[PDB]
C-alpha cells in the first residue's frame, strides 16, 4: 500500500503490492517492484530501480541510476526469492548496486544504518554492511563479504569473497583485500597488508587513551610478537578482561574464515 | 559477484 | 519491424526501422535506435539505451543503465556508420558499455555468446569478445582488444589497446594488462605478469590430464626454458602434433602484436 | 526560459526557471533543474540529470546516465547553494558525475572547454578542470583537485583530495596520485611517482625543441640535481627568463600545497 | 568525495 | 577508449 502522504511521481512505476511509507518520495522514472517496502521519509531521487524482496528503512536518500535488490551476479543463482534489507538514514549515491542474496549464502544481503555508499559502490549477494560505514567511489564488495561498524573502504578498492572487514577498519583507496581485516586496523595495498591501528578514527569516535593503547597492544600481539594466532588468542582475551574494546578482536576471530591480512 | 582475486 | 509476440513497454521508445524479435521484452524507459536488431527472447530490463548499427542475438538479458552500440571514445571517430554484433544468451549487467567500431579499426565491435559482463564492464570500439567469457565489475577493455573463449577478466582490471587475452586465461582482479596473454595462462599485477597455467579452469572445462600436462610443457618452453619465442615456436608446433590443445598457442602467436606478458 | 529553437523531448522534465539555449537538445527522460543554464547547441542525449546552480556552455555532448551539478559527497555539505560551471565543446560520457562545490571549499566546481570525460569519470566538489583535458574510464578526482590544461588522467586512476595535476601531465592508468604533479611530467603507480617529461605530448602540441630541452632541464633540477625544492626554485625562474614555457613550473609551485610526487 | 588515500 | 597505460 502507498501511504496517503507519500509522493509518487506520475512517471514512476510502483507495482501493485509495493509498500511506500509516510512522506516518502518516489521520483521521476523510478521503478518499484511488488515485493518492495520503502520506509517513512525515504527518497528515490529519479531513475532508481528497486526490486526483489527488499525492505528499505526510514529517511534514506537513494540517488539516480542506483539498482537496489536486483538479481545478483552469482552464476549459481537461479531466481530463488532471496532478499535485501537496508536500514535507516543511508546515503546511497549514483549508480550504487545492492544485490539480493543467494539460497546457498543464507538468502540475505543486509545494510545497516547511517552509511554512505559513494558513486558506483557495489554490495554483492549475501554481504552484510553494518552501521556508519563508508564505501568510497567504485569500492566493490564480492559475495558474502562482511563490513563491520564504522569501517571505511577506500576508492576503487575490491574486497574478495567471504572476507570480513572488522569494525573501525580503514582500507586505503586502490587496494585489494584478500583476507580478513581485524577490527581497528589500517590496511592498504594489493594484496592489502596491515599498517597499524586506525588511531585518528578511534580518537574521533570517543575511544579513551587507555582503550587505544590496549588495542595497539592487541595489534602488537597479533603482528609483532612473532607468536601464532592460536598462542595469542588467550593473551588478547586476558587483555579484554580489563579493556572491553579489545573483545572486538575475540568476536572477530570467531567469525574469521580466510585467515588474517599480514 | 566473483572479482577473481588470487 | 516489431514481432506481434514482442513486448514493448508504453514508456519505451523504439524508433521506426528497429527490428524486435519474437517474445523479446523492451522494458520501461528503454531507447532502441532505428538501425538496431533485437533477437528472439532478448530482454532489456529498463533504462537501457541501444543505438547505432547494432545486432543483438537471442535470449540476452540486458540490465538497467547499460549502453549498447553507442558512439565510441576514440578521438579519431567522426560519426561513420560502424557496428556492434552481440550473440546469444549473454548476461549484460547494470551500466555495462559496449561501443561501436571505428573505420580505422575494422568497423566492428563483436561479442559472442554465453558471456557474463558484470556491472560497469566496458567493451571499447573494435574489441572482439568470444564465447563463455567473464568480465568482472569495472573490467575495462581499451580499443581493439581481443578476449578469447572462456577468458576471465577480474574486477577493476584494465586491458591496454590492441592486447589479446588468450583462451581460458584468468586475469586477476586489480590488474593492468599491457601485453598479449597466451592461452591457458594466469596473469596478475600492474603490469600483469604470468603466474602459471589456469589448471583449475582447464580441469572444470573437461581438459584431459595429458592435455593439461602438454599445455604446462608449452608454458615452460615460453617462460622457463630461457629460449627466445622464435626458437620455441617450432618446439610448441611439434608438441601440438600429439596434443591438439597446444595448437591454441600457435594460433595465438600468429595474432599477437604487442609481445607477451613476462 | 527555453529558446524557441531548442528541442525538449516530451518525456524530459525541464523545471520552470531553467534556461535552455538556441538549438540545444534535451533528450528523453532527462531532468533539468530550475537553476540550470544550458548553452546554445548543447545536447543531453537521454537519461541525464542536471541540477543545482549549474551553468553549462555551448556545443557540449552529455551522454546517458550522467549526473551534473548533483549534491557532493562531502560529509560537511549541508545543502548550501553552491555551484558548477562547465565550458564549451566538452564530451561528457555515460555515467560521468560532476558534483557542486562546498562553501568551505570555495563554492564552485569548474570544468573548462574541449575536455573528454570518459565513462564513469568523477569530478568531486570544488575541483577545477582546465581545457583540453582527458579523464579516462573510471578516473576519479577527490574533492578540491586541480587538473590543469591538456593533462591526461589514465583509466581507473584516483587523485587524492587537494592535489594539483600540472599542465600537459600524463598520469598512467591504474594509478593513485597522492601529491602534486608538476607540469609536463609523466606519473605512474600507486602512489604515483615521476617518470620523466611527457615528450610525445609536448611534441604533438607544438612545443619547440628548445622548449622541450629547457623543460627537461627544469625536471632534472627538481628530481635529479639532489637539491631541495627551495634551492632549485630560483634556478628554474632563471631558466624561465630565456624559455617562457618553464614559467609553468614557477606558477605551479605557488599553487602546490601537498608537496611533489617523488 | 574522500577516496581515503593514505 | 584509450586508458593511457604505459
Coordinates of C-alpha atoms in Angstrom, one line a residue, chain C residues 31 85 122 125 129 153 156 177 185 217 246 249:
Chain C
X31 CA 15.5 3.6 -26.2
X85 CA 27.3 -7.5 -33.0
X122 CA 33.5 -1.7 -20.7
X125 CA 35.5 0.2 -30.1
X129 CA 34.9 -10.9 -27.1
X153 CA 39.0 -10.6 -16.6
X156 CA 38.8 -3.4 -11.8
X177 CA 47.3 -5.9 -18.9
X185 CA 47.7 -18.6 -18.6
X217 CA 55.1 -28.1 -21.0
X246 CA 48.7 -26.9 -27.7
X249 CA 49.5 -21.3 -28.7

